[PDB]
Amino acid sequence: ALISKKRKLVADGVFYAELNEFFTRELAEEGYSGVEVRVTPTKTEVIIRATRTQDVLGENGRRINELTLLVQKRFKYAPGTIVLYAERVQDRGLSAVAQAESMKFKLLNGLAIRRAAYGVVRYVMESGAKGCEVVVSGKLRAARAKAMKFADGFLIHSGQPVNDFIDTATRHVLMRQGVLGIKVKIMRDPAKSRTGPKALPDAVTIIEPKEEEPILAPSVKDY
Amino acid sequence: RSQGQINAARRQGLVVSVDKKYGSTNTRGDNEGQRLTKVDRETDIVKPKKLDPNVGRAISRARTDKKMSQKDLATKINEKPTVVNDYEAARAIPNQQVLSKLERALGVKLR
Amino acid sequence: IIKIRITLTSTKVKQLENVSSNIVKNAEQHNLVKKGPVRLPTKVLKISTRKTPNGEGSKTWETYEMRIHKRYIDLEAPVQIVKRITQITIEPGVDVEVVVA
Amino acid sequence: MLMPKEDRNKIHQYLFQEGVVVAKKDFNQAKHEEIDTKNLYVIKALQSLTSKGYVKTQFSWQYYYYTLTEEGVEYLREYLNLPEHIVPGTYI
Amino acid sequence: RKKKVYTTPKKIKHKHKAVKLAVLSYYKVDAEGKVTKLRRECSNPTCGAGVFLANHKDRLYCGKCHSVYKVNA
RNA sequence: CUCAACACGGGGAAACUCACCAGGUCCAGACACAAUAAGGAUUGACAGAUUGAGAGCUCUUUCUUGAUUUUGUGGGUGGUGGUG
Known part of the structure; x- marks a missing residue:
């Protein structure tokens, strides 16, 4: 904290752009398409939008535990306060x-x-x-x-x-x-x-009307 | 394939496989002509024969540190001196005809 | 009970107003005095680059804007219900800070 | 690099310990923030490893990104340690 | 810029090559078998009796230090 | 270099920027091969000379270092060098 919201909200933007260019360069061979950050208390989380999640999620948890370390080393996060998810792509x-x-x-x-x-x-x-x-x-x-x-x-x-x-x-x-x-x-x-x-x-779009009956039988129906 | 049966199977029949080839006669072979369709119909990214891990490192020295330069080496295999440059350590997609001329011009039997 | 204050800051109007709506909806689900959402003036952050690389061409200028919307709600609540209402309404793009006193 | 042997030990052990190094593209940067050695040493030690294999590097926004490969984890054992130890995030 | 002139005197001169003398580690040897100190040790607590103080001309200079240990005599 | 160059390169340059000029250091020349090399591959330095200079630059001197360096052969890397 102890940072103005003008510098806080801008710094969130440049942090996102640095992350996005990292994953374009890194996960180029896995069909990467985007990220979104969810800044929450207790472990802010990051989702990776890549087609072949079976490749992004490596063997036995590798290749995303590595990327979890790479992000928190470069951005000076506390250990365990960032996690990386990979859900695949909505209609690639x-x-x-x-x-x-x-x-x-x-x-x-x-x-x-x-x-x-x-x-x-x-x-x-x-x-x-x-x-x-x-x-x-x-x-x-x-x-x-x-x-x-x-x-x-x-x-x-x-x-x-x-x-x-x-x-x-x-x-x-x-x-x-x-x-x-x-x-x-x-x-x-x-x-x-x-x-x-x-x-x-x-x-x-014009809602099509329903045609009516002409005479309509002048009368009264009661209860 | 090559004279194993193409005379033995021609016993008084004279027509089995007499159709014409693809027809370039100086453009190089079709060793990846099958793979060219597969990368065309498959609607994702596929990795193109990624790298040259040790056939780069070990065979650059056995070829070129012996006597020769890449400007000389690329001249006898008839390729541009940047083609051999990207066969040195990494950063190439290895095709068969270039890698075959690389082998038969300097002897080292690593494919 | 204790005097609390919840401050909300975002760059998205649609994602912020419903979060404040959930805050007040949970505020009169179990009734307590509101001091409801006081919207601060919106901040427009302007960056005026030129248009180009190298200075060839007509001297055309761009301006880019980021809009910061800020809202604070001054509640009072028992200590128990503070944590749950501060943890349920968590949405991407909205930054929530809670001042103890 | 001259890079005295007690500074290979700090660099190589930390690469074994986590499996990743990022290290800040800035030469003459005077004591890299994680390892107790100079930042020039960290960048140039792992350039030596990369050319022979053993690690893969990514560069983005004036920062490096070093990932220990499977041909380097086995090599870095007898350099520093004994067997049956897991360097990378393979440990569950 | 087409070429260089090098108006400085033609100096492709390099450093002394960490000058390669013969074997030199010699306290002195008497017969059977003792040895005594020459080119005496340093007064540094961090020089634990293993360094040789060079005597150039009225100077005692240690090489364990980067620059300067002067116990002059 | 007409509009569509000339308070334009966000170009208000004291150093830095910096690309230019007179000079001094350093390698940040990865890896592979071959040689030197534990009778030491090599590294650093007090004082003086020298130097714009408290740059061990280089020299005089004689300590320190220890296998990472050095030399050669191929390469590697960098370049506000060229070609818009």
Whole structure:
């Protein structure tokens, strides 16, 4: 304590960003997608959002007891006051961070660019997305850089609904010729949205009326 | 495969397996052409033949500390001098044709 | 009984107001005097970077904001029920401190 | 590195004791915060281990992250200790 | 920057190579068999009678210390 | 270097920043091989000379250190060095 809330709330943010960049670098080979911290009294806890939890949770408790030590050594936590959980991913076909790492590692196995990228867009469409778009930019097959974009569905990128329905991820893939850039935008449809708005702002639905009987039989019914 | 049966199975029939190959005739072999489909249809990340743990460390010295340089060594195997550079300790995906020419040009029998 | 004070600080409006609502709901589940949620003025923390790396282009500026919402509730309670109500309403993004006197 | 032998012992034992070292990318940092030795020694001792195997390093935000591998835990036994001792978080 | 001139006199000079003399640990030996101290020990409590005080010219200098133990005589 | 360079590089530089100039240290050259090497691989130093300098830089002197270093061969690493 003894720190102002202005410096306290900012320091919580930079602590989160340092953790997130650590796990992108460390759990790159396990399909990592994000973290969230739950600052509680008595052992603040950290959850790791990675597809293959059977790999993140190593043999007999290794590979996450190691990461528990690595965090509390670097951030000077007391022992036992931080624990690391790994629940897997909510529908990995719709996360742009996870689908960019999939796009990255498919490129590093020497897959053709047009095949590795059409295999990502069609998987995201299979996952119930309304539109997604993959951009590969760099020196693709020549010495002069170009940019290829692969799209399906539709995407909106205009306003506040971008903050609601767009997930973006940028990845640097390191090649023999140089560096290629991977950009994945995924627009999850608002119909399956659980929280927040559930429709686009200019979408109107009219409740269909039920037709009535004309004469309606002028009379009285009593009790 | 190679003359084990392809003449013995040709006893007055003359057609079993006479179809044409893939058809490059100077582009390299298809030793990973099977694995290229598997990384295409599997919608996750797979690890590409991770590293060269001791075939890097031990065979760099037996090849190059003997007489030679990598600028010389990459010239007789016909690859760029950074290809041998990433076969030195780590940081490569090892393919068969490059690793075969690495073996037959300098003798050390580690694959 | 003892005079207590609970201070809430967060960057999320929706996640904070329901926590204070649970605090007051547990406060008149078993009745005691409220001195209910007094909302402090919101703090806007502004960082104005330029836009870019290197200074080529029109001199365009951005401003980024973090919004700090703060609320304190001044309760009095027996010593037993203090711990349970301070431990049940724990939610991510909301920082709760409890001053003893 | 010259790195006198009584400072390999402090470094190598602590890597055996926990299995992790983080250690603060800053050379000439004057007595690293966990081990009683210099911070330059901690960074350069475990660079020697990494090149031969025995440990894997991650770097992020001016900090290193050292993890003892399974080819290094067996080696670090006869360097410092006797058998049937568990270095890493393998101990339940 | 194209090259270097090195206007300083052409000094690729290096340190003394921790100068390699012959075997030197000798108190003195008499016949059968005793030995007595020469280049006497230090007055340091942390030098437990194992260090040799060099005598350059009117100086007694210890090497267990980094810099300075001066019991001059 | 027209708009789309010229209170712009968040560039209000006393040192630091710092990339430039006159000079002095150090290796922070991992690992592998080979050699030297427990008749010592090597490391550090008081005083004086010397030096901008209380830099053992280097030298005079003779103590200390002990197998991590040194030398050579390949590499490794770093670079506000080049190419936007």
